[PDB]
Amino acid sequence: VDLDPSARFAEYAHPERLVSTEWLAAHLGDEGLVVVESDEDVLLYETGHIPGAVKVDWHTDLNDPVQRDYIDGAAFAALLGERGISRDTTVVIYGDKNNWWAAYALWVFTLFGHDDVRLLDGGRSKWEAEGRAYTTDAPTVAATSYPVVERDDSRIRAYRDDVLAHFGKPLIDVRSPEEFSGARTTAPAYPEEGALRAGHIPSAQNVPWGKAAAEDGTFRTLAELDALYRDGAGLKDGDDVVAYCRIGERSSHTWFVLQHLLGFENVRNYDGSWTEWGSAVRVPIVQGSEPGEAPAPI
Amino acid sequence: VDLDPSARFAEYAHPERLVSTEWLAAHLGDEGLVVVESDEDVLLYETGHIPGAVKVDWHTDLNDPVQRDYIDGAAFAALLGERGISRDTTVVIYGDKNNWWAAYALWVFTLFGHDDVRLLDGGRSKWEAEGRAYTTDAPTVAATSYPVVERDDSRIRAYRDDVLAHFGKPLIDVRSPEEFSGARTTAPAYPEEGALRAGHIPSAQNVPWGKAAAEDGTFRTLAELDALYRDGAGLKDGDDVVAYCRIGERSSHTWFVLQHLLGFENVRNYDGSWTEWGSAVRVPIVQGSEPGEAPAPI
């Protein structure tokens, strides 16, 4: 299944990671293509979704049911086969909130080493605004076989003890400035994603995740994104960059911007994020909207 | 300042760690004695407190104001000097909820290597029930000098990574059975001490902390405590025992039972507790009222 030649994506480091609404519309039904809805609000799928599209539910499908971790490769294989996805399938993911969760799903696929995963620029917003068709029909899929591969946390995921040893290397905190400063422990809309303590990781640069998206829901031009991350947050070629929100689901979008649109080679998602960090014992915290000086590597 | 010869304390491993209401009443005003109120409800002090008694407020006095850790030895020295406590002072601590917080304060003193700290058996309850006098007078204290010593976390405190390496060695979870089982993430009365996930550390034995206390607020007889911890939770001589609640403040009472009343030589408080554990990434959790099989040391 082919690539989108849109001049807009061509400036980006990995244009192959993006498809337009017009490309996907032209490609609906193609053999080798499966469309996945990945929404923060999992109930949107049933309101209307892109024809042939399947749903991944972050509450039930992507997380261990009891323990705080992503599923293993057996459960991932059963998830993807049930949805007619094979190892070689081109997967295009779109969803609500400007592909916030679409990016998170893309990130989980990458842990499992699925190569051809792509975001539908503008997600549900831009499909809806261009008046393209939804269906409420439960799509009908022939089950396939998907290989059982071991999950790879090496390249794109950061644990707590990795972030403690990271000081002197750049940190992006993608949370509202009020959470950044420690004025709130969490966003108003998410009381259940609070922590004991308030502030940010010392030396973290506040880049709320929404700034990487235009009003239409598409990713900003490379130049605008260069302004934000290179000039604004002080990232340069070779930097080992860790991004964090409250939960890893919410820091996946920025991960995707840094790794696939700006082409930073070493980009890790700290999924523990503030829900872990603000409840952990004897981990560095500062308050105020100043990044802060980093302490000694722990 | 002398020891309480009460026959009741004499069976305990460290009788010197306990004083009765009748002993303290006989000893009020003695040079070398300072009484400390340590309450979960810090406002009780102002309702009426033991004459000459000072207050330690766990919200403001014992914790770093921003970061999740206990104060350092400079702030501890200033706390104790301000209250007329010198290195050689006998400190007797009492408070509400059957000395729940009194034990927590005793635990913080021990981190700072203060030797003669003692609990008033029965705390505020038993002082009140025997109709002994309170005052609402802000007591008046000559400031003393207290040495600056480095805080010792080696002997009585456990961090997360210590508990991950602890499997195959005994764990006491002192939380309500409903939190133990994962039916609730927290106790009804403490919504702000929840976690993302619910259950207990696999192989942990549920011994709610209240069972070590009689209805009067005194510690149970050694035999009753032997029933609970030795027979019930399967502790034997030489065991490295870690106890945990939601926060370390609440697991200090049990620590004090295991270390000073039963005389277990190696007893650590995991202060991170469930607020840390139930929000940490990729740490073992089980549900149900069965302890569970331990996994491999992490």
Numbering used by the authors:
A (entry chain A), B (entry chain A): 3 to 300
From the paper:
Sulfurtransferases, also known as rhodaneses, facilitate the transfer of sulfur from a donor molecule to a thiophilic acceptor. FrST exists as a dimer and can be classified as a TST rather than an MST according to sequence-based clustering and enzyme activity. Each subunit of FrST comprised 11 α-helices, two 310 helices, and six β-strands and was divided into two distinct domains: the N-terminal rhodanese fold domain (non-active domain) and the C-terminal rhodanese fold domain (active domain). The active site of FrST was composed of Trp102, Val176, Arg177, Glu181, Trp211, Arg248, and Arg252, which surrounded catalytic Cys247.
During the crystal structure determination, we also solved another crystal structure of FrST, which belongs to the I21 space group and is annotated as FrSTI21. The overall structure of both structures is almost identical, evidenced by an RMSD of 0.284 Å (Cα). However, when FrSTI21 could closely resemble FrSTP1, a distinct conformational difference was observed in the 8α-η2 loop region at the top of the active site. In contrast, in FrSTI21, Tyr192 tilted toward the active site and engaged in cation π-interaction with Arg252 as well as a hydrogen bond with Glu42. This arrangement resulted in the formation of a cavity for substrate binding, unlike that in FrSTP1. The swinging motion of Tyr192 induced changes in the active site cavity volume of FrST. Volume analysis using ParKVFinder 3.0 revealed that the volume of the active site in FrSTP1was 8.2 Å3, whereas it was 12.3 Å3 in FrSTI21. Three substrates, namely benzenethiosulfonate, methanethiosulfonate, and thiosulfate, were docked at the active site of FrSTI21. The tetrahedral sulfonate or sulfide of each substrate was positioned at the active site in a similar conformation and interacted with the side chains of Glu181 and Arg248 as well as the backbend of Ser178 via hydrogen bonds. The benzene ring of benzenethiosulfonate was located between Tyr192 and Trp211 within a possible range of hydrophobic interactions.
